[PDB]
Amino acid sequence: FELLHAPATVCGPKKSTNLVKNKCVNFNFNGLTGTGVLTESNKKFLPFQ
């Protein structure tokens, strides 16, 4: 396994949940084992990041 943080494809066989904003949750994105509050931001990205 080539373990990194770049966009992964081969993800495990577990179904997804929905999302709740403005409340402290322990999100699990494609990796990203953290905890915080999810607020819609304004930082304008670029088409690849």
Place this chain on the structure above:
Amino acid sequence: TLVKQLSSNFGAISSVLNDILARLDPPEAEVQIDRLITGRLQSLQTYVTQ
């Protein structure tokens, strides 16, 4: 420099602890976690002394 010291291996497989935890079995986690604990404790003692 104190904050930047957190992002270092110190000899373990990876820096971030919450990625070690979900990536090694409990019989193997303590060794990596211990390497991190000793390193971070040393950094904190250095900062306090200065």
